[PDB]
Design a protein around this ligand. Structure first.
Ligand SMILES: Nc1nc2c(ncn2[C@@H]2O[C@H](COP(=O)(O)OP(=O)(O)O)[C@@H](O)[C@H]2O)c(=O)[nH]1
Ligand SMILES: [Mg+2]
Length: 178
């Protein structure tokens, strides 16, 4: 499919990675989505009047390693690190996923978007929005609070990540010209 952008959904179990993915690609909030299913999904979109083919890996399962995860961790061009605003532990695990990316890629410069999901569960919030914003400033990455239940800011997440990949790519082309 022309030039695909491989994207990887990272996050603890139960933060809503599958819900956000299904909402992005099909506008459907899943009913009883099996939390053990890991799979990749294709979708074509337009950011800034330019189309892009996306290939998004929705990570899951209790196995330590899979052929799919191994390939996408190495070849992925962008990462969506997700936590739930109702689960502070999943918010701390975000830092562990950032470490995992460096251990695989041996770099910190891979495009990343940080997302706090389940924003609609306002009364169960365990992590403030300012804490996410501050952590994203630590990572030098965009931040969003989303609701996969009602599709709040789901498009903005994947658009921002593709924007980052494009900007980083155009920088390498300009550096190669000099
Ligand atoms: N209220 C609310 N519930 C959510 C949201 N995202 C996911 N969930 C629920 O959280 C549970 C686990 O979500 P899931 O997509 O399977 O998380 P995953 O294991 O990271 O893929 C499911 O029962 C979803 O209905 C959200 O944005 N708002
Ligand atoms: Mg899932």
């Amino acid at each position: 499919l022309s030039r695909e952008y491989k994207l990887v959904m990272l996050g603890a179990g139960g933060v809503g990675k599958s819900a956000m993915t299904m909402q992005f690609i099909s506008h459907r909030f899943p009913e009883d989505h099996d939390p053990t299913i890991e799979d990749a999904y294709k979708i074509r979109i337009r950011i800034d009047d330019e189309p892009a083919n996306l290939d998004i890996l929705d990570t899951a399962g209790q196995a330590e390693f899979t052929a799919m995860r191994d390939q996408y961790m190495r070849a992925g061009e962008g990462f969506i690190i997700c936590y739930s605003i109702t689960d502070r532990r999943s918010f701390h695990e975000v830092r562990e996923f950032k470490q995992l990316i460096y251990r695989v890629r041996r770099t910190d410069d891979t495009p990343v978007v940080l997302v706090g999901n389940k924003s609609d569960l306002k009364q169960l919030r365990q992590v403030t929005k300012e804490e996410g914003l501050a952590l994203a400033r630590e990572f030098s990455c965009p931040f969003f609070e989303t609701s996969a239940a009602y599709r709040y800011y789901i498009d903005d997440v994947f658009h921002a990540l593709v924007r980052e990949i494009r900007r980083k790519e155009k920088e390498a082309v300009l550096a190669m010209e000099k």
